[PDB]
Amino acid sequence: YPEEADGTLDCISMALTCTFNRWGTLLAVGCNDGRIVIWDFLTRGIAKIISAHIHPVCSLCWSRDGHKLVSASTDNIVSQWDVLSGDCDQRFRFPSPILKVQYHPRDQNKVLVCPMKSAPVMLTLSDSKHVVLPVDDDSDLNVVASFDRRGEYIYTGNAKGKILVLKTDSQDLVASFRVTTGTSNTTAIKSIEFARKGSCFLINTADRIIRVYDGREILTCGRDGEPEPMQKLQDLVNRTPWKKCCFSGDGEYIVAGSARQHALYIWEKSIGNLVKILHGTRGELLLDVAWHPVRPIIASISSGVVSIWAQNQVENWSAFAPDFKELDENVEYEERESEDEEVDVTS
Amino acid sequence: PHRYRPGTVALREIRRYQKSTELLIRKLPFQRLVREIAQDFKTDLRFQSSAVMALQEASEAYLVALFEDTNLCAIHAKRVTIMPKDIQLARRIRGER
Numbered sequence: 001y002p003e004e005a006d007g008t009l010d011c012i013s014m015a016l017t018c019t020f021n022r023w024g025t026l027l028a029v030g031c032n033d034g035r036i037v038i039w040d041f042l043t044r045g046i047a048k049i050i051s052a053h054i055h056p057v058c059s060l061c062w063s064r065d066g067h068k069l070v071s072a073s074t075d076n077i078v079s080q081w082d083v084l085s086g087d088c089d090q091r092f093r094f095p096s097p098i099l100k101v102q103y104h105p106r107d108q109n110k111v112l113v114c115p116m117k118s119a120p121v122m123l124t125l126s127d128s129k130h131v132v133l134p135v136d137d138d139s140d141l142n143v144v145a146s147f148d149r150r151g152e153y154i155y156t157g158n159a160k161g162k163i164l165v166l167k168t169d170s171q172d173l174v175a176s177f178r179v180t181t182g183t184s185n186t187t188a189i190k191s192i193e194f195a196r197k198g199s200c201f202l203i204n205t206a207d208r209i210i211r212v213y214d215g216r217e218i219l220t221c222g223r224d225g226e227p228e229p230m231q232k233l234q235d236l237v238n239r240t241p242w243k244k245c246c247f248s249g250d251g252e253y254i255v256a257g258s259a260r261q262h263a264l265y266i267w268e269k270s271i272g273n274l275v276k277i278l279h280g281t282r283g284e285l286l287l288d289v290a291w292h293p294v295r296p297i298i299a300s301i302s303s304g305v306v307s308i309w310a311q312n313q314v315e316n317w318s319a320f321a322p323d324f325k326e327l328d329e330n331v332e333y334e335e336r337e338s339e340d341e342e343v344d345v346t347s
Numbered sequence: 348p349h350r351y352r353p354g355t356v357a358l359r360e361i362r363r364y365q366k367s368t369e370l371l372i373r374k375l376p377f378q379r380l381v382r383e384i385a386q387d388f389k390t391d392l393r394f395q396s397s398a399v400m401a402l403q404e405a406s407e408a409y410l411v412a413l414f415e416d417t418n419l420c421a422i423h424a425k426r427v428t429i430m431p432k433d434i435q436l437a438r439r440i441r442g443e444r
């Protein structure tokens with residue numbers, strides 16, 4: 001779990017956002033002049049440079065099949081690409097600029113797109129049959145929504161504080177609760193993220209407090225519930241507001257990045273204490289933080305600089321010697337003078 | 348031709364620089380030095396001019412005091428010249444190293 005500086009990337013400036021696939025092999029660096037730089041880990045090389053647009057590419061999302069990205073810009077085009085040769089299959093010149101795109105994890109014909117002002121409405125790939133997700137109040141002008149882990153539901157979030165849950169395509173109103181922010185003043189939501197094992201999730205509020213909930217708990221709560229949080233996270237010393245949160249590779253180590261100071265904070269899901277504060281160049285302002293799913297190394301995007309933060313295996317490599325244990329003083333023991341199992345190898 | 352013997356045009360300019368009191372360090376190289384070694388602690392800083400003047404006066408006074416005590420060490424060692432082991436001795440004795 002990351003503890004070092006370990007190197008960085010001076011390859012292409014003006015980096016803005018990135019994310020990963022299921023496997024953690026490439027790195028889709030979003031750029032300001034409408035580019036997606038793709039860099040490799042195990043070979044440390046840049047395979048394909050898709051010069052997509054000229055406008056700031058804001059959101060990105062990989063799919064499960066390993067073929068279909070989706071993005072948008074101030075070009076305001078819901079684009080799509082393929083990593084074989086840079087094949088822009090579709091091109092949706094749309095109004096109302098975009099913040100976040102999100103697939104269904106296995107029914108990858110359905111993508112979920114957040115506009116600027118009104119409600120997120122589920123787009124598709126081929127047809128323009130967008131499925132209207134009914135938000136009641138509509139006076140908040142910034143409403144964010146997402147799936148669960150398996151794509152089995154749709155979770156939403158307004159700016160007042162009320163949370164609604166719909167079915168993934170037929171929109172069953174099954175859960176309704178307003179968040180318990182302060183006493184008389186509630187707050188808005190800025191992101192909600194999800195793991196790769198389990199249905200725990202975080203609520204990135206805007207009174208500098210992260211709140212954590214589970215899916216089974218709110219499905220037990222349901223309509224008109226008061227779900228208490230699993231965990232309440234903040235930092236009262238430095239008085240820090242938050243920018244972007246995520247999860248670990250197992251949903252245990254919450255990695256939330258700052259919005260003032262270029263620093264990472266890492267918690268535990270179970271206990272809930274801070275474990276390590278990371279640092280870097282003190283004269284930057286951090287925007288996007290990427291977590292790697294199968295091997296805990298973090299990426300940090302600020303000023304076009306993307307950094308690789310490993311832990312170097314300082315303990316040692318122990319590939320050769322499970323044997324050969326050490327004797328400190330010269331211990332001597334020089335008195336001494338001197339077809340059971342058949343497992344399918346072809347399996 | 349006309350030349351002085353060495354030491355004369357030391358003792359004059361010693362009396363002259365002990366009379367006159369202004370700067371003795373050209374201020375734009377000093378301001379670029381301050382911005383250089385303040386770059387490494389925080390980026391995009393912004394100095395007022397009086398702060399640069401204060402740093403200049405403090406560093407000038409520190410170097411003058413250091414050269415007086417170095418001169419004392421050099422006259423003590425029955426030499427006249429100054430060698431860098433004298434400066435290292437003075438900062439060893441004063442308690443800053």
